[PDB]
Sequence to fold (1077 residues):
Amino acid sequence: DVTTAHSDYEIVLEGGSSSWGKVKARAKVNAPPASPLLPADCDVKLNVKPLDPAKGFVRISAVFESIVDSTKNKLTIEADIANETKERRISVGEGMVSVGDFSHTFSFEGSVVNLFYYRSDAVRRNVPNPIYMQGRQFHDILMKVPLDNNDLIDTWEGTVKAIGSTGAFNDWIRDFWFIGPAFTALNEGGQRISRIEVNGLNTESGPKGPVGVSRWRFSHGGSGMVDSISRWAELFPSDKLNRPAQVEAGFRSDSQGIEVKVDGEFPGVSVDAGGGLRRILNHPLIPLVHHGMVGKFNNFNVDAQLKVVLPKGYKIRYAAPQYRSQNLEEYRWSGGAYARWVEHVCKGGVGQFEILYAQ
Amino acid sequence: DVTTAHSDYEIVLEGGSSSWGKVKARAKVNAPPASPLLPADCDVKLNVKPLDPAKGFVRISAVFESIVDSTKNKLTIEADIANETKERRISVGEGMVSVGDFSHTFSFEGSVVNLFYYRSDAVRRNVPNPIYMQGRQFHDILMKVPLDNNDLIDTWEGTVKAIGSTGAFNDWIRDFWFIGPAFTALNEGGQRISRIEVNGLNTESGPKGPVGVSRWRFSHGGSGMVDSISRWAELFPSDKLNRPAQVEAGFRSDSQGIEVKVDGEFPGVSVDAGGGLRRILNHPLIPLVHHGMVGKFNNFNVDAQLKVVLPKGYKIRYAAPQYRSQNLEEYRWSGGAYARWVEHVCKGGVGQFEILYAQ
Amino acid sequence: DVTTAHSDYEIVLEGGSSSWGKVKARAKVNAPPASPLLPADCDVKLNVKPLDPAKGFVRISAVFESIVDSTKNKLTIEADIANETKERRISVGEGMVSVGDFSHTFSFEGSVVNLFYYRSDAVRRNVPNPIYMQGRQFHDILMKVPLDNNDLIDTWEGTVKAIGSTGAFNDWIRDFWFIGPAFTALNEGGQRISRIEVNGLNTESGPKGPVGVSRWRFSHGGSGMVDSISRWAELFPSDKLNRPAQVEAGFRSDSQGIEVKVDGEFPGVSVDAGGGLRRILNHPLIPLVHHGMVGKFNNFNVDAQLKVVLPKGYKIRYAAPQYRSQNLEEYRWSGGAYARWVEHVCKGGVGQFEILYAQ
Ligand code: BCL
Ligand code: BCL
Ligand code: BCL
Ligand code: BCL
Ligand code: BCL
Ligand code: BCL
Ligand SMILES: [Mg+2]
Fold:
């Protein structure tokens, strides 16, 4: 037996200053996942449609479905979201969660204010492609859940009794919130979750059955690698959504290994690089930092290939690890310095791999 | 030179709902330990006897002996311990420490209260084999040490003067307490040690010589992987100790490598799995998480084998990584997906490897 | 393609209880750095001269020059520094920073008080070569920067407005201060940076242009591996600087790999070991702990050799990983247990490799 990682990644780019792209991925490794419960199979579906361009609103949906050991899980969430200002963004929404025989629903309203610690022009003009951006991000959340199970009233009253009876509740809550190795992953990425504030508890804010209502804030700090904070605008290109976008991702896994597929189509794949050039967006760092926590437990060979198809007439002007071949606007990366880049990022490395291209 | 890990693990299971088992292990790797002082040789002996079944009391002993670089160390501790309630457990005890020419003794009384943050029945019934359990655990400690060296009065007065003269003492103490990489290992496992409280300092609580007396509390939180908090009941099967149990473990190590042997016999090895099945208990996560911090520094081949001997007539119904062979109730795991599991766990992975069996 | 690490390290030792030595290193690996911006090329120059032996003063200089992606960076700092007491040390100094079209200058005065949490004699006498030393270190800093750009007045007023307007400023500042993975590296090494105090803000403390003036303190704790705290005296051998010392180090790097050279000459290389023996100083732990965070992302072979040249007549009495050869006072380590030690330390291991020698 030998442990090999087989992957194929594909990127097909829309033309113009359309930043749109199709992304496809297939991956196979015969190594165990680091889930203490297995088998672990999961499918995710994300869609997003322009709702009101002019007020900036987008309607986004997410369906998470999985089976763990044997337990069937489901979570959906659909929400309306828009930029109010450069740092203030707002949301109203709804969803449901389910695990085996249990389900509940929920609705919410939420604001999020993203603040960079500094905004120097001596930085702006001297660093062409900046990466690290330190900042802190402020969530303000109104959420409601119908209390229609009796598990829900039990957890409600357990919590209501926990608050007010403890006082280190907005501190210790993080122990519960960031379950398992999620806790550890906070510091791995230079991420800090502040203590919460509870600004109220209401019963019953909804005429149907009893409804449990939470008014709470938290804050999260990042030292620079946290894409949520560092890449606040970019990660939400409402402005480029001229039509509905979508991604389907899935994995199957067990003691024998991991299989994953990805298919999607969405803006943000390429960005203006300055100077008539464009690039594939900078690799977000959290995916690589957090997968790093699992990627080092078995030695593997890399059988990996990337294909990039540029729009018609476009040429690559520069590529970090260089490509192996080209055939009109199709470029392919395989072995050599690219296989070493793939080994590197799978294990936690964030070494830059850059592709700039122009007509 | 090539770096190989040679190991053999053996598990012989007592019948019935006896959860008792014999555990044996031998391990060899020709890679250096990550101790900044070497050679590093250590032997540990643990025993435990039923003292008063009816009041739940157990008498447990531990002897740690080591030699580091050249320094001879010894620590023993024997204590009486029992479950008072489901979360409150109590202890009274004594021991000694020694390093070269230095020794001191000590006696103690201690309570520990283990609290889960939540207890939902929607979880209980829908997840057959749950792993992550978030909680917090409260130590309340009366300890006494005879001040019979003058190193002991020096450390006493140094400490007495440190307290009261500092005020961030119950915070900074963690810097001293979790020496070296032990500090780091706290966050690795989703573990938090809260600040201490000091509830008094007494002289001299003992008629013989002067006696230094500390009344202090601390708290520790875990996000789910902390077996101490997550597996509170299980890790202390007083109820299954119908006779004295024991474990002898040892390692020899240096710049040339690591050798380890383990022999023991104790309850808790198998558990009822529900449905007439039993399993080997879930792998505790802290051993794997903390050994992970050292297991990634040299590449190695795996020459590893597990033998499980079931009681007479019992069959394995399921095994994660499957076994290679069987001969009556002896099952053996070697190479393939098992060697990959062993590589994985030695390096920090916690991928589930499950064995369920029944008559 | 195969990934190999090629290195050569050389140590030439001055005789007597001169602790002086020449250190040379060359390293090559064809693996990518974990910098999200590449190419990344950097040169560093450190010098140090006795200024006033009798008052213990040393004059030290540092020049950091780099190019990242395409951005040209420079930082120099020269300072006068001396031991006042065993734990209090003082500094006065100056420098400049520059990035592209931007530069500023600065002058400073600073004290640093290094405190060990404990000083037991039962430790001192029983552990011949102690490593872990827990402690905390207190910086007290007066710094001034001419406000001669308008980027500098902009950052000044932005900061002045940030202080006083926020209140969790001396907490959140760490998010900004420890940019990127630097934050994470704090906990990796058992290192804690406390909140700051701001003891004043002054304008304009300098007759020329406007001058921004900061009076601030911070504290840092280490659990034992932090060489700054654990090896406070040793890391600053002012007493052994009978002449000017120096080190030139440099690396070139990109998607293709990493190249590094080092040349220097300075005291502190060997230490009295007790018993007529001397050793190469204990490996500092932070270099190895922090490089560990990058060293595990690509598999590699080791083609490494260490040469040690002892002074004339000196013999090695003991070496951890043993040497392969000797020719008069030249000793060479290659392959076997040494290549495994090199793999180990490059990946984060701190396993002791010891060399003791005497006449
Ligand atoms: C995830 C890392 C950050 C974070 C990320 C930020 C960011 C960034 C945003 C929010 C915003 C939201 N966050 Mg938040 N926030 C986090 C912590 C949480 C927690 C929690 C209990 O821990 C809560 C309650 C909230 C909830 C809030 C809401 C008030 C708000 C809208 C959520 C939503 O519409 O769902 C989203 C629906 C999903 C479940 C999809 C999630 C999948 C994401 C993570 C992956 C994106 C896929 C991308 C790579 C592919 C795009 C293609 C698709 C076709 C679109 N956040 C952590 C600390 N938060 C949004 C906002 O500003 O609204 C005001 C927003 O832009
Ligand atoms: C280790 C991880 C947790 C923790 C684990 C918990 C748990 C769980 C328990 C205690 C309990 C105790 N803890 Mg505690 N507690 C920790 C921190 C410490 C520290 C410290 C200075 O940091 C202190 C003072 C205390 C001390 C206290 C005592 C008041 C009490 C009884 C100790 C004892 O009898 O020794 C024990 C004797 C030894 C030295 C043996 C230790 C070896 C252990 C760790 C390995 C078990 C071996 C097992 C795999 C094999 C079993 C076979 C044998 C034949 C039995 N804990 C950390 C944070 N603590 C017990 C209690 O509740 O009493 C009231 C208890 O069940
Ligand atoms: C680096 C890890 C520690 C730390 C290390 C300690 C130690 C130890 C010392 C100081 C001291 C100083 N620290 Mg400090 N301190 C740190 C955080 C910082 C920060 C910050 C903004 O984070 C600040 C403002 C300060 C600044 C201060 C100054 C007040 C003071 C003198 C600095 C100096 O002359 O530069 C130094 C010039 C350079 C830029 C060179 C730096 C390169 C170093 C790190 C490598 C040494 C090379 C060695 C291996 C080779 C020697 C050969 C040469 C020929 C000499 N420290 C962190 C937490 N600090 C000194 C003091 O006590 O003065 C009162 C001192 O001895
Ligand atoms: C509340 C969640 C936020 C969200 C938070 C984030 C965060 C965080 C990130 C992005 C990132 C991206 N987002 Mg966004 N962003 C939002 C939704 C917007 C909308 C929109 C108009 O609604 C669009 C089109 C996009 C699209 C963009 C892309 C520019 C970028 C993905 C680059 C890529 O090649 O992915 C490649 C596609 C894949 C390889 C993965 C596809 C797999 C699917 C399943 C994603 C699942 C994520 C998984 C880890 C689950 C986390 C969910 C939680 C558990 C709930 N975002 C919503 C509002 N987005 C990433 C980025 O690079 O930004 C700089 C990034 O880190
Ligand atoms: C105060 C310490 C606690 C203790 C705390 C813990 C903790 C924590 C754990 C256990 C675990 C176990 N404990 Mg207990 N538990 C206590 C004592 C009880 C008693 C008893 C009746 O006295 C018994 C019989 C057991 C036995 C049980 C087993 C169910 C389980 C081991 C499974 C195994 O296959 O190990 C296999 C045997 C080995 C592979 C190792 C044998 C090696 C010896 C030397 C153990 C040394 C540990 C080492 C890391 C040193 C730490 C000591 C500190 C530095 C002081 N415990 C005492 C009261 N126990 C583990 C578990 O899986 O629980 C879910 C676990 O994490
Ligand atoms: C303010 C900074 C401090 C400094 C802080 C430290 C720290 C911290 C350490 C040392 C270490 C050393 N210091 Mg000192 N020390 C100071 C300056 C003194 C002076 C002096 C008389 O001025 C001298 C001669 C020395 C020399 C000594 C040596 C005993 C020892 C290096 C052993 C070695 O073989 O290196 C081998 C040489 C190399 C392999 C590396 C040479 C490369 C150059 C470029 C160093 C760059 C470091 C790099 C990581 C950049 C960090 C700088 C910041 C970003 C600003 N120090 C100043 C006052 N020094 C190390 C040690 O082992 O101590 C126990 C150590 O960890
Ligand atoms: Mg880590």
User: Anything to note?
Assistant: The longest strand of chain B covers residues 102-116.
